[PDB]
Amino acid sequence: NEQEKELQRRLKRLYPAVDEQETPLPRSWSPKDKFSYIGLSQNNLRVHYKGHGKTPKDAASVRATHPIPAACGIYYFEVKIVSKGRDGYMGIGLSAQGVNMNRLPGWDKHSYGYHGDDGHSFCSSGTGQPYGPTFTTGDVIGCCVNLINNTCFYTKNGHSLGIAFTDLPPNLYPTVGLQTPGEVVDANFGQHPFVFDIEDYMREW
């Protein structure tokens, strides 16, 4: 078992008020809390699509092991697109517990998503809205939840896109969703420095 001193260090530096004893920080994807078409690797940081991929009914999401602790104040995580696979039907965001995993983040109630194929944002519905630019292989996509003013914004390659959602519900799980064969994404939950200057943004708070 790796000690992961760097991860722990960053976690303590970013979220010093969080006592993992009561609200543990999400450190990886959940092998239980996912859809069967999703396969995990790299200590559950890498997500692989391995299903049919015929229609939207083949969409598969994964949640983190734990929901974002309120004590974070502000929370951040990043996803590196290892491969867009076929169509790059990839969603990054947040979903409440027990939200259906047979879809992409944002489609269901209490689910929120930024998709790579169209750059759209999905605030609790199958219908999306023009939010940012499309992303694919090579790109890093970030997701920042402000637990103080109840807002969320994404980042692309170190650069903030706008606020995407306001008035978010509590106890949200970082989620990633795939749908096309060949799609592969890596999460950064604090293991590595982030591309976006998260600490600068936090300093305004």
Residues 6+ apart with CB under 8 A from 131: 114, 119, 120, 121, 154, 161, 162, 164
Domain, as residue range, for 166: 1-205
CA distance 149 to 91: 24
Tokens of 73: 């104040």
Can you give the CATH number for the domain in which 152 is found? 2.60.120.920
Helix (H) or strand (E) holding 11, with range, is helix 5-14
Residues 6+ apart with CB under 8 A from 12: none
Are 127 and 59 a contacting pair, CB within 8 Å? no
Q: How many domains does the chain fold into?
A: 1
Q: What is the 8-class DSSP label of residue 195?
A: S
CB atoms within 10 A of CB 143: 25
Tokens of 56: 């939207």
